[PDB]
């Protein structure tokens, strides 16, 4: 898993970038160790990285070769055989496949690309959420309270806006409670602490 990738990265990527059936066959033939679950898995991860980097056009080219590899591993499990010894007959079947076969090949490619986009979108939203965590940190008041939250937690009245607010000293110690949170969130600066 780990260092299969480290050895063969360029070759997996190269296979990911091919497209013509004869070339894909030939390349796997010269490097039959590429024909395995680990290359499928790395191609899947590389598609998500490309789509997050906004290399959308290349992700589609790589996704096609991913589905090809997945289809090789599937047909191998069907036949009971080793994928390295039966991959050539995927290519043999694909070059003259019925129209209906190529239609389902295409639907599974498109569905795959959708799952890849859903995964990239998770990584992007993770980064947006981190960004907004820091926007949040940056507007915390001196006592660590967000004046957006505190504003909304206040009884209705309070000032989209001074000595008027002051005359509103009518309520028990609940007043200490919201006032303290206004000081801690920077909503109110005690002019003389």
């Amino acid at each position: 898993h780990k260092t299969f990738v480290e050895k063969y990265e360029k070759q997996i990527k190269h296979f990911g970038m091919l497209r013509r059936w004869d070339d894909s066959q030939k390349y796997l033939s010269d490097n039959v160790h590429l024909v395995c679950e680990e290359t499928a898995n790395y191609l899947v991860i590389w598609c998500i990285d490309l789509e997050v980097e906004e290399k959308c056009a290349l992700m589609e080219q790589v996704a096609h070769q991913t589905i090809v590899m997945q289809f090789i591993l599937e047909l191998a499990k069907s036949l009971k055989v080793d994928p390295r010894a039966c991959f050539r007959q995927f290519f043999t079947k694909i070059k003259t496949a019925d129209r209906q076969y190529m239609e389902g090949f295409n639907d599974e490619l498109e569905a795959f690309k959708e799952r890849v986009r859903g995964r990239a979108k998770l990584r992007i939203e993770k980064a947006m959420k981190e960004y907004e965590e820091e926007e949040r940190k940056k507007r915390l008041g001196p006592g660590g309270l967000d004046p957006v939250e505190v504003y909304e937690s206040l009884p209705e009245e309070l000032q989209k806006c001074m000595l008027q607010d002051a005359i509103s000293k009518m309520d028990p110690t609940d007043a200490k409670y919201h006032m303290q949170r206004c000081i801690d969130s920077g909503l109110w600066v005690p002019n003389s602490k």
Binding site: K10, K13, H14, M17, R19, L50, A57, L58, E60, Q61
Partner: protein, 206 residues
């Protein structure tokens, strides 16, 4: 009355890289153009399964390479489906956009020039050996037109009233660069075709 249009930006960018690259295995252009000629021929062959009279404008299915040493020109002809004026504009000037973009992306991610035919844009590889192309084409559905490019941002399209008439299909007329004159020699051409296009299913006439 020739008309001028700009290429999508990604196509102009790709032509720029290709015409300037010092990539030394330039002969792969001929492979790409022969593979396009073979696809254009499959197209007309497919269409004529339901419609045999489509073949009648040129019943012979072939690819033909003719050097013209006195013009420093190499022509690659096919009797495939051809392109209408609107197909010349669209196919060469516009919808290649996503293929040329994916290929430029591949080139920053570890691919090299000889992988261009994996992205559906091998046509543009002709700029490895030419500074200019005329694409002369005759589709059954239109007149004969000339599309012309010099790898810059614009191309022209002109009703053809100068060249030999084509029953159907397309000629790529390449205006070879000064350092790429070897592709005029029959011997050099035979070695390149034997090397890369042995498996092509149409006769290649030279």
């Amino acid at each position: 009355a020739s008309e001028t249009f700009e290429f999508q930006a990604e196509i102009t960018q790709l032509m720029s890289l290709i015409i300037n690259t010092v990539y030394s295995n330039k002969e792969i252009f001929l492979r790409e153009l022969i593979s396009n000629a073979s696809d254009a021929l499959d197209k007309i062959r497919y269409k004529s399964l339901s419609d045999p009279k489509q073949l009648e404008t040129e019943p012979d299915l072939f690819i033909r390479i003719t050097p013209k040493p006195e013009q420093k020109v190499l022509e690659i002809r096919d009797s495939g489906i051809g392109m209408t004026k609107a197909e010349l504009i669209n196919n060469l000037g516009t919808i290649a956009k996503s293929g040329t973009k994916a290929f430029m992306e591949a080139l920053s991610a570890g691919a090299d020039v000889s992988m261009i035919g994996q992205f559906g844009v091998g046509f543009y590889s002709l700029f490895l050996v030419a500074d200019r192309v005329q694409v002369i084409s005759k589709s059954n559905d239109d007149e004969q037109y000339i599309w012309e490019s010099n790898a810059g941002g614009s191309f022209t399209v002109t009703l053809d009233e100068v060249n030999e008439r084509i029953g159907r299909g397309t000629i790529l007329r390449l205006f070879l660069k000064d350092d790429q004159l070897e592709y005029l020699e029959e011997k050099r051409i035979k070695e390149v075709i034997k090397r890369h296009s042995e498996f092509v299913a149409y006769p290649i006439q030279l």
